[PDB]
Amino acid sequence: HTTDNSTAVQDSNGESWNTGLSINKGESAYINANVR
Amino acid sequence: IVGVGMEKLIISTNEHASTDQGKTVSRATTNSKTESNT
């Protein structure tokens, strides 16, 4: 016969970074022309 | 007498593409206790 009681506290922290990029294949850029 | 003649066709695929990336850092601490009786 054996009986035990287990107590514990768990602590943790986190930290994250992200980076994204989106593109449209239909309108990918806009052009400007200098004319005379 | 006026007519129209077509020379070539160009297709612009209306599509949207995205790219994501990330990083994560973590750290856990646990201090367990046990009292065994027999």
Numbering used by the authors:
A (entry chain F): 359 to 394
B (entry chain E): 299 to 336
What sentences appear in the manuscript?
Some bacteria express a binary toxin translocation system, consisting of an enzymatic subunit and translocation pore, that delivers enzymes into host cells through endocytosis. The B-components of the C. perfringens, C. difficile, and C. spiroforme systems bind to the host cell’s lipolysis-stimulated lipoprotein receptor (LSR), after which the A–B complex is internalized by endocytosis. Then, the A-component is translocated via the B-component pore across the endosomal membrane into the cytosol, assisted by host-cell chaperones, including Hsp90 and Hsp70. In the cytosol, the A-component covalently transfers an ADP-ribose to actin, causing F-actin depolymerization, cell rounding, and eventually cell death.
